[PDB]
């Protein structure tokens, strides 16, 4: 029975947590809540809802065919491809086993029936749950963190000067900063601001004691904490500041009351020598004592919006805010309370043809001439939350309502929960780990955001301007030839304001960084004056006979001469520099030819060239590659190709290699490959990453710092990227296996499986040709070889061995 009989007019004793404890008994849980004292609790159970979807043919101890309108699983089943799917029928989860004769009377079919993964409120009285005030007043303070030889437990409370730090493998010694740096000699001013959630004043002078034995540490700490709690009022929480050792949130000795989610995530990944504490380790203990207030106030203000303070998921995936707000709104307009397998959707069987989208706009206008110069730059942010504002579909409307609510909860002065969660949308709709029919929502965002971005880029036309590059984060623009700041100001402010007005919000735009003259063909090929040269194809030329240096010399000379002509003016000078190149390029090519062909160390001149993870061409004769690369940049930095073609016909004949041969044609030396929308936990930002482009020789140790998130400089890690590449291989190979076949004569798709020829006499052919997969496997292999991805190499080697 309940804790009290007169519960109809409910006693307003708000909860701190609900602790689901099915380990004890099936469906049992403990509810922990607040009286004037620090805690009280009661043991309770809820009817756990299966959507059995049948009481007629199969039945149990309840005919609960009640209130039939939750239609959204039946709508999610479009991926399962079934029709006329009316809403529901329901009963308790009575056992851990199905009625295998799956059926339904509302319409006959097969259904998931799983629903209640978490209890969120009682069924059999409930309060309004305003004035939740979930802060308990007294508790012990603790900390876990360790390196293997040098581990650190920490107990330190303001009520006492005694503290404790004791574990180490250096049995002959003791941890020295545990006195003179555990005492911070520093109290932070923000304690005065976030103080009143704590009963005693915070204080940070301490002294310590010690032990050394693996048998003794945990047992002794258990006895110590159980005795320490009796100094305070008996029943208490234990405010653990962090549990970075051993994942000691769950693996700790029994607490006898609540473990709260005070622990900070593992942000300070300190595994160095522990002797360096001074004020640094002090702050790791002391400012984290302020984080008792930070994390608790954060969780409490989150509970203002979805009523779970101390056992709440934020700082983790943090999806529960969106998920449970969306669920309770989909109860206001009754649709569903969602599933959450480790896989993505809320449904059973799947047709892989619809998954092919998961198995498999950002224009490069590549203006290497520079005309309406100004200084060319722009930047755009938070485009997803900006996207949803402009538009079964009632669930999509309710998603807009939720986003509108959160961005409205951004206050007119300062707020942090709403800000962090509005950017949580931005990463949530990108993360593959997200749930609740996740790929459909990702596809919906990408479709709508493509339309919004196309509107934004296209509507520049009414003001005099031009665009060089566009991506959802990065844009490059031009408008005028003098007074760069004033020229940029009118177009940027007017466009940003009217973008926002026309799209209900788009004003999250910024513009400041310098390129005052720029010839651009991606980072693959560009150069500009602020002189910066960033040519990726240059990295594929040899340094023998100074060919890289001569490339840089010719390109820089051309850029500087045209720039001097522009500045003197502030068209025709193209021809003057073409004549200067007609002399200099000839001389340089003669020089490098005579040198490199005279290099006696060359076993083959193909051996002369460098290798990078994007390398595929059979480069053979460095003067020819030099001419080809120089003439490519010259042919694209001006529309006047006549002198460049004359230079080609001159210097190719100087090399005595024929024009119109395949070796005379340019091809990109780098097989660029991009992993899009890589999410960073340092900043909650997402950006596109090229794995073949980078100069691996100069950053082989620092490849992952080089693979930084552009919002910051924090890395993306080899382990996650290797697993991602293996996953990409698997979904791609699935697409290959389940591909369609098309007849070569009439180009229609093969209708059924047994014929070897079409309805006509034509042969069938692959829609996904094998050489595409061989090329992408070679890309992945070179990536993995340059970055040491051995597990990906195992999968690649097997996939390469079972070949023709």
């Amino acid at each position: 029975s309940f804790l009290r009989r007169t519960a109809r007019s409910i006693l307003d004793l708000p909860w701190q947590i609900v602790q689901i404890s099915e380990t004890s008994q099936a469906g049992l849980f403990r509810l922990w809540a607040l009286v004037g004292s620090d805690l009280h609790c009661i043991r309770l159970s809820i009817p756990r809802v299966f959507y059995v979807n049948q009481r007629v043919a199969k039945a149990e101890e309840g005919a609960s065919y009640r209130k039939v309108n939750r239609v959204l699983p039946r709508s999610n089943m479009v991926y399962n491809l079934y029709e006329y799917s009316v809403p529901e029928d329901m009963y308790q989860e009575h056992i851990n086993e199905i009625n295998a004769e799956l059926s339904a009377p509302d319409i006959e079919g097969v259904y998931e029936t799983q629903v209640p993964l978490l209890f969120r409120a009682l069924v059999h009285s409930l309060a309004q749950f305003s004035y939740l005030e979930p802060g308990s007043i007294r508790h012990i303070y603790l900390y876990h963190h360790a390196q293997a030889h040098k581990a650190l437990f920490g107990i330190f409370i303001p009520s006492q000067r005694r503290a404790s730090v004791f574990v180490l493998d250096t049995v002959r010694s003791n941890q020295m900063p545990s006195l003179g740096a555990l005492y911070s000699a520093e109290h932070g001013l923000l304690l005065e601001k976030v103080g009143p959630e704590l009963l005693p004043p915070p204080k940070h002078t301490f002294e310590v004691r010690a032990e050394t034995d693996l048998k003794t540490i945990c047992r002794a700490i258990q006895r110590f904490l159980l005795a320490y709690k009796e100094e305070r009022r008996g029943p208490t929480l234990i405010a653990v500041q962090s549990s970075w050792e051993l994942k000691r949130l769950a693996s700790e000795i029994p607490v006898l009351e609540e473990f709260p989610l005070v622990p900070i995530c593992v942000a300070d990944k300190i595994n160095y020598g522990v002797l360096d504490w001074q004020r640094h380790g002090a702050r790791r203990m002391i400012r984290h004592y302020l984080n008792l207030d930070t994390c608790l106030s954060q969780a409490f203000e989150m509970s203002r919006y979805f009523h779970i303070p101390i056992g709440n998921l934020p700082e983790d995936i943090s999806t529960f805010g969106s998920d449970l707000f969306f669920a309770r709104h989909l109860q206001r307009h009754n649709h569903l309370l969602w599933l959450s397998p480790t896989a993505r959707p809320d449904l059973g069987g799947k047709e892989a043809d619809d998954n092919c989208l998961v198995m498999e706009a950002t224009v490069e206008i590549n203006s290497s001439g520079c005309y309406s110069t100004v200084c060319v730059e722009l930047d755009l942010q938070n485009l997803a939350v900006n996207t949803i504002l402009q538009s079964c579909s009632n669930t999509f409307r309710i998603l807009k309502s939720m986003v509108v609510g959160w961005v409205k909860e951004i206050t007119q002065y300062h707020n942090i929960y709403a800000d962090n969660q509005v950017m949580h949308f931005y990463r949530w709709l990108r993360s593959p780990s997200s749930l609740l029919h996740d790929p459909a929502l990702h596809r919906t965002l990408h479709n709508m955001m493509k339309k919004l971005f196309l509107q934004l880029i296209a509507e520049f036309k009414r003001l005099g301007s031009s665009v060089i590059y566009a991506n959802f984060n990065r844009i490059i623009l031009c408008t005028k030839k003098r007074r760069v700041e004033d020229a940029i100001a009118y177009v940027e402010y007017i466009t940003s304001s009217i973008h926002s007005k026309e799209t209900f919000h788009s004003l999250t735009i910024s513009f400041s960084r310098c390129w005052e003259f720029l010839l651009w063909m991606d980072p693959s090929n560009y150069g500009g004056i602020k002189l910066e040269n960033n040519w990726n194809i240059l990295q594929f030329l040899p340094q023998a006979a100074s060919c890289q240096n001569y490339f840089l010399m010719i390109v820089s000379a051309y850029i500087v001469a045209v720039y001097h002509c522009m500045k003197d003016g502030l068209t025709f000078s193209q021809d003057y520099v073409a004549n200067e190149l007609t002399q200099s390029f000839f001389t340089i090519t003669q020089k490098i030819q005579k040198k490199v062909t005279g290099s006696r160390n060359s076993t083959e001149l193909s051996e002369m060239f460098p290798v990078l993870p994007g390398s595929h061409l059979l480069l053979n004769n460095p003067a020819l590659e030099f001419i080809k690369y120089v003439c490519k940049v010259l042919s694209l930095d001006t529309n006047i190709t006549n002198q460049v073609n004359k230079l080609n016909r001159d210097l190719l004949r100087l090399v005595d290699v024929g024009e119109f041969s395949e070796e005379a044609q340019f091809r990109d030396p780098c097989r660029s490959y991009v992993l899009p929308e890589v999410i960073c936990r340092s900043c909650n930002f997402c950006r596109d990453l090229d794995l073949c482009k980078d100069s691996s020789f100069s950053e082989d140790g620092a490849v992952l710092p080089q693979w930084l998130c552009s919002n910051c400089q924090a890395p993306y890690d080899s382990s996650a990227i290797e697993m991602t590449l293996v996953e990409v291989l698997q979904k791609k190979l699935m697409a290959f296996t389940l591909q369609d076949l098309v007849c070569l004569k009439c180009r229609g798709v093969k209708e059924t499986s047994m014929p070897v020829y079409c309805s006509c006499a034509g042969d069938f052919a692959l829609t996904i040709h094998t050489q595409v997969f061989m090329e992408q496997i070679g890309i992945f292999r070179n990536i993995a070889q340059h970055y040491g991805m051995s597990y990906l190499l195992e999968t690649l080697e097997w996939l390469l061995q079972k070949n023709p």
């Binding site: 004769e101 069987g349 293996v726 979904k731 699935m734 296996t737 051995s790 195992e794 999968t795």
Partner: protein, 175 residues
Amino acid sequence: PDIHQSSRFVFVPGPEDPGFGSILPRPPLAESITNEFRQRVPFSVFTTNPCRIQYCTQEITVFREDLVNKMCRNCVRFPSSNLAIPNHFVKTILSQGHLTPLPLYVCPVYWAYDYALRVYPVPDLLVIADKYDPFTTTNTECLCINPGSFPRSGFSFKVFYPSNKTVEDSKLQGF
């Protein structure tokens, strides 16, 4: 010493395993995740799913790429119900003579190695270890068994005596 020196510990990965996905016949998982087991337990193998065991005088097929509920949920007119379900399933798999008698998008297979999934000539034991409930049955003097989802099914492993040509319908909830 005795189990370590006699018993063959053989592993046949399925969908929820690292490496290659739900594409048949399922290749073995990565060798870096097997070498440490192999070096101190030489009486062990890591191999494909399905897999074939030849005994001195019997032949056995092992397979677990789950399809019983798939068979039930896309019958042309209707499935055939009650405790007869496993018998109809083995009738289906034996008459079709192929471990995957269902479309490719429902159960992907490498095209050129589709012959490896054949159940013709009929094996002496057919072990289809689906997540479905465990069962035992026989047809055309072939034994056919599901050891079942052990955690759900009340800890019901199964053990087979080839020389005696028989199996135990065990339930280890009582251990």
